Amino acid sequence: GCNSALLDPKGQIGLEQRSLILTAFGLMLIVVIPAILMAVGFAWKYRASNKDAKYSPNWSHSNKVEAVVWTVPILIIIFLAVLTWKTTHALEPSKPLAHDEKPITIEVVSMDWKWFFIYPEQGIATVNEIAFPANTPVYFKVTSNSVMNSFFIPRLGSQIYAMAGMQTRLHLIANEPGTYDGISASYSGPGFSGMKFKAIATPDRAAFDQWVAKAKQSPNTMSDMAAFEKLAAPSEYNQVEYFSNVKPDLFADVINKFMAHG
Amino acid sequence: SHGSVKTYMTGFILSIILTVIPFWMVMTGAASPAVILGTILAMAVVQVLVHLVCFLHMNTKSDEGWNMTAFVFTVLIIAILVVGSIWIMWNLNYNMMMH
Amino acid sequence: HDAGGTKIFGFWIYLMSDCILFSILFATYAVLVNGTAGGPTGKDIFELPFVLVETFLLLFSSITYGMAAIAMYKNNKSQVISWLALTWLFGAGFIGMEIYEFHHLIVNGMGPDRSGFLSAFFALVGTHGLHVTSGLIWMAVLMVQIARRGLTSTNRTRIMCLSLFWHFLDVVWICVFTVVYLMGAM
Amino acid sequence: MFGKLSLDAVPFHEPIVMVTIAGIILGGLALVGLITYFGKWTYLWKEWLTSVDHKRLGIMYIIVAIVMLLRGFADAIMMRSQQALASAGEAGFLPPHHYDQIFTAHGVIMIFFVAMPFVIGLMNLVVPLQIGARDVAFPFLNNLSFWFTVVGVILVNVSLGVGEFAQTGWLAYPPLSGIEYSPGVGVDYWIWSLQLSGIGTTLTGINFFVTILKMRAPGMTMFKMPVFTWASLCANVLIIASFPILTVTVALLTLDRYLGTHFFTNDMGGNMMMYINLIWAWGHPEVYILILPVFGVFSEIAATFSRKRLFGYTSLVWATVCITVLSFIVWLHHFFTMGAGANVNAFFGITTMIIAIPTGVKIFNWLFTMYQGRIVFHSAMLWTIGFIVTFSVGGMTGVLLAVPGADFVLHNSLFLIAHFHNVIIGGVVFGCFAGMTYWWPKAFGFKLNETWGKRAFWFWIIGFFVAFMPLYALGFMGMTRRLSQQIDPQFHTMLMIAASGAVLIALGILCLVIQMYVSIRDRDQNRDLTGDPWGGRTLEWATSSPPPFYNFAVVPHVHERDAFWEMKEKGEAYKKPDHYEEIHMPKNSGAGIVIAAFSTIFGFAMIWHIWWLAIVGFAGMIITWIVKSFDEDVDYYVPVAEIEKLENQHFDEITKAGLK
């Protein structure tokens, strides 16, 4: 699908992701197309019913054919392996992005069948919805409050797992303003179909400041760990929620619920 | 598990040494943790070999030479996992920290 | 027709499978060794004299089984059942010390239900103890079979396979004392 | 009478589960009444249930496989229906509670009970007859392995009517499957269902690795065996190395669940990641444990119906050995997204991509077999050409997903199920049907019906395409695994196309039954009276129509790589030996099924927390082991009267066949 989320992506990371995919495909085609083609070709030119064919019943070893049947696949895999080394080092989710900004830090908590988001530098949190100005690196810290999930925004870039008692790092960027769907890509129990969130890429920094302004006006607040545990109660298809105040270092406190340090 | 009895008693003596030395080495604290670890590992692998020679009578002839190729094979596989695992998890821990 | 040969080869291959089974628990104890949760560590619960006496009992057991096998190959029945009785008594001493220590642990709130370290410790050492008590059962049933049937073909092949098993138990214990107890007590 | 077990463990409320249970117990009543009408009880007992014949045991292995394929496909069809409906804005009929059970059970069955026994049983059938042996190195072990597989199946099917099955996916990820998050018994069923079954599989792997080395016929150096034995040998090696890992991982998890240990828990020191690392260390060998035997099959067929010698024999054996080795250094690629750095990922992605050259050499040698042959278009070689075409694309997708930067997007998407379905259905199921159509005359004396089999193959291939090739596009547009509700509508069309293909596959499977039926109904006209219904090449074809309980009356002596063909060529292929000799053979035992019954009781008591009966089960099982070691009436001798009788029969049939 050309209009796919992966084949028409909007973040840089996904952009090189797709370029990688297509060069790998067009590299493997060179020995998989001839395979099928020869398969049917021989199936027909050497059907028992044929006569003009040359039927050699004892041709079992040609060093030429062995050479060329070992020589092309080795070359292709050399090239792919070099590409894989380079790209793997060039797209580690835990690696800063080279751009003249200050990345916006977002903290991601995988509550029972919900995505919790904390903006610490802004003192707000939202349930099932985030926003960040396009053309600005976004630094995601990720932890699971319950069972193994996977944070993923397909049309923007890469996914990353989410474990309880551990922190994970991802870096993404959006090349065009719009709304993108993100989901949990690891099964996590009964309401796994409702772990859908919407991520906005505002055109300007203004609109971003306006969305922060909006969140700043909510009647709710996440200040005690009591409210965290109140919200984390099992639930499904949660409506998008905003919170005014936020216990300063609450991400760390969650992670500490399971005692990690070092 | 059949051989001469003299061989079995020699193996007894060698293994008695190759046990007694590490324990004195570690409980009294004779040298540094590096010499300690080196010597205990070395001596362990040497006792394993001594048991597999005198006590297990492991030859390169029996069973068409497949008793050994089996053994060696297992070793490699163990090396592949025990080390591999240790590596993977070790890394996976450092990349899960509150950096 | 020589079926004992293939029986012994197959037991060798099973023992290799067992070596794999054990290496996995070794890797486990490696990955969760310092995974205590504000609890005891290897240096605080391991008393080494105990461990060394257990070792020497097992080593003695391995030697008496070698001598039992030789008594087989010289066609003595009483000799075989004697060396076997002795081996079984030493192995019984081994498991007796092991159960004493494990119970003294759990009765002081240090069972495998307190930290991923104590859990892996119990896994490894109990996996070894289970193999050893299985060998104890095997040894007793084979001994009564020997006493009532003599040094027949089946019994001889069975002695050889039990020999492989006992020697391998001791070989795994060398590693268990080198990597768990010693490397921790350090 | 005790435990967690209650009258409130059966879905009394459920219209769907309860009708299924009623129908299954009615069908059980049905087969029982049928068998006791005929009076085939004693016959079953003394010929099939207690048999130590690799032929009989392989047949029963394949029977279990075929009859659980039905449950597997039932679950697949239901899943497709639920999805095509939830895409359309409809509630559907399968809540998550059930839906998740369904996908867990389906994966488990199709990997452990359909795929595994099919291959293991074809091995059991044809490997001893190929190496020129009378039986396997360990008969009673074969019996016991089969019955451990049966205990596992009985457990995974009891879970359906009493209690539930794991809602965690087929590999039971730790945190979700712990006692905190999944308090119910579904994981426990999963735990003893495989463990017990595993205790069998391992033995079977050990069992064959011995045979293929020790019990060969004199004159067949290892570089003369037929390629199936080579591949089978490679497969056995991997089983021995691989299944201890699964044993210990499931054991640690049952410890976590039953005694409160902290191996993979979240608190108190545990580490979940280690589980994900360990199980895939077993998981990735196992796929190979399946692709390697089927590979052999295709080779054999490629050489039989193309009617020339396999190309690149040495290269094929070295390919399979390299695969065996390299199958232990690629498991990390099943969790590239769990955080490990760039170096671990790069290394393991390389090592996974390096696993491609062997299989590519394999398919090119297969192709150059067909190159200048005479291709007879039998059902089996249709299956083979289709295997080449399908598995090519499947493995290409796989290679592309072995590049970590791409796995970053395509992990767990429908691309993953597309690819791994591709390779399994393409490479595995395709070849197991190829193998049954190839070796059916050697097991019953008649040939399957060609028309219905060709129909089955065409439906299968077209339906697999129209089912799964929309999932490549779907996983490309973001749809992930295991969703069941309020599915995004922009996935509707593709999904509604997928279900269509599933229907097609049903027809193929339906064809299969018809293909079987009209064959047996008409068994008295379509017989293989020589023993060689295809112009074969290997030793199995030198035996009788349905071979004798002892494969050969006089162990053959090999001199070249294809034994039977060169015999057919010198002018000396059916040469009655001069004096026949008593044959020493093993007896039939009812002890194995008894160990297995005690094991079933033990597992079912462990799953419902009935401790006295779990104790009685273990006790009885070990006790029975200790009592079967006492009795020495374990083997008998076949006299020369019977051997002469049977071989006179077969050589009469042969002289009549060369006669007309």
Ligand code: HEO
């Ligand atoms: C039949 C079973 C089977 C087999 C044989 C395979 C064989 C391969 N598999 Fe697949 N796999 C199989 C069933 C699965 N795989 C899986 C998971 C999996 C993953 C990780 C999953 C993820 O991304 O999260 C990768 C990268 C692959 C790639 C491969 C590759 C490269 C091979 C290769 O050995 C095959 C490649 C074959 C080729 C390429 C033949 C064509 C070659 C030609 C024509 C010559 C050209 C030469 C070159 C291109 C070098 N597998 C999973 C996980 C399921 C789950 O997640 O629950 C399953 C079940």
Ligand SMILES: COC1=C(OC)C(=O)C(C/C=C(\C)CC/C=C(\C)CC/C=C(/C)CC/C=C(\C)CC/C=C(\C)CC/C=C(\C)CC/C=C(\C)CCC=C(C)C)=C(C)C1=O
């Ligand atoms: C979520 O789970 C799932 C669903 O449920 C919602 C689906 O419905 C489905 C539908 C799937 C299917 C219908 C699969 C297709 C099935 C096929 C092809 C049949 C397979 C054929 C076989 C021979 C299976 C092998 C059977 C066995 C080994 C025996 C198993 C024995 C069983 C199940 C016994 C169960 C007995 C009971 C429940 C008795 C209960 C007794 C009582 C309630 C006493 C009450 C009496 C009083 C007086 C109150 C499944 C299974 C899925 O797992």
Ligand code: HEM
């Ligand atoms: C009749 C052909 C088959 C169909 C239509 C089919 C269909 C499916 C579907 C729809 C899923 C889940 C898709 C999703 O998660 O969105 C699935 C999962 C799976 N299938 Fe199949 N399948 C078939 C044959 C097989 C075979 C032959 C195997 C042999 C291994 C197999 C093994 C699996 C496994 C392991 C899973 C994953 C289970 C899980 O993740 O919970 N399937 N199948």
Ligand SMILES: [Cu+2]
């Ligand atoms: Cu894999």
